[PDB]
Amino acid sequence: MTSLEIAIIVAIVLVIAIAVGWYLYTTFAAAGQQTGLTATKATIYVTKDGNVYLNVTLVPQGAAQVAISSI
Amino acid sequence: MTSLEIAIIVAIVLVIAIAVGWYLYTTFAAAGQQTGLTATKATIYVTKDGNVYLNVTLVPQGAAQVAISSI
């Protein structure tokens, strides 16, 4: 087909290819941030007056600021 | 044919040829401006008070001012 046609088709083709490629990149960058909490040490402490409190040690697995909902 | 005829025919022929040639040029110049958006980084952010906002990085593919319709 005429070079005009190859011009049009290559333009649209390149736009679509770049879009999909950097879509893959962004999906990878979002999947790499999957995170979660893990505990390495926990011993509930109790005082003489009845006050209790948990003294735990956390380590965030991943690269993010995990949000604690409830204990 | 008589040079009168060749004069007439070459005039009309040259007009038509120039018209079609610069038609091809203008079609190429219009096809070269095919454009589109592409994203390279996107991470939705959320505040403590519930306000959310997307912080994306855009790069226009092509040579034009793309118009965003909806997200």
Author numbering:
A (entry chain F), B (entry chain T): 1 to 71
The study reports:
We present in this paper the structure of two additional archaeal T4P, one from Pyrobaculum arsenaticum, a neutrophilic hyperthermophile (optimal growth at 90 °C, pH 7) and the other from Saccharolobus solfataricus, an acidophilic hyperthermophile (optimal growth at 75–80 °C, pH 2-3). Although the full spectrum of functions played by archaeal T4P is yet to be uncovered, they are known to mediate adhesion to various biotic and abiotic surfaces, and play an important role in DNA exchange, intercellular communication and biofilm formation. Finally, we show that Pyrobaculum and the Saccharolobus T4P are at the forefront of virus-host interaction and are recognized by two different viruses, likely serving as primary receptors during virus infection. We show that whereas the N-terminal domain is conserved in all bacterial and archaeal T4P-like filaments, the C-terminal domain of bacterial T4P is unrelated to the immunoglobulin (Ig)-like domain shared by archaeal T4P and archaeal flagella.
In contrast, the sequence identity between the pilins from P. arsenaticum and S. solfataricus is only ~18%. In contrast, ~10% of the residues in P. arsenaticum pilin are charged. Interestingly, and in contrast to the S. islandicus and S. solfataricus pilins, P. arsenaticum pilin has a 15 amino acid C-terminal extension that wraps around the globular domain. Within this extension, an intramolecular disulfide bond is formed between Cys139 in the extension and Cys80 within the same pilin chain, which is likely to contribute to the thermo-stability of this pilus. In S. solfataricus, we see clear extra density consistent with glycosylation on seven residues, all serines or threonines. In contrast, in P. arsenaticum only a single density consistent with glycosylation is seen, on Asn55, which would be N-linked glycosylation. First, although T4P of a neutrophilic P. arsenaticum is as hydrophobic as those of acidophilic S. islandicus and S. solfataricus, it does not possess the extensive sugar coating. Instead, T4P of P. arsenaticum is stabilized by an intramolecular disulfide bond, a protein adaptation to high temperatures previously reported in bacteria, archaea and their viruses. Consistent with this prediction, boiling the S. islandicus pili in 5 M GuHCl failed to disassemble the filaments, but under the same conditions the P. arsenaticum pili come apart. Interestingly, Iho670 adhesion filament packs very similarly to S. solfataricus and S. islandicus pili, with an RMSD < 2 Å, while P. arsenaticum packs slightly differently from those three filaments with RMSDs of 3–4 Å. Notably, the crucial N-terminal subunit-subunit interactions in these four filaments are almost all hydrophobic, except for in P. arsenaticum there is a glutamic acid, which may contribute to the slightly different packing compared to Iho670 and other archaeal T4P.
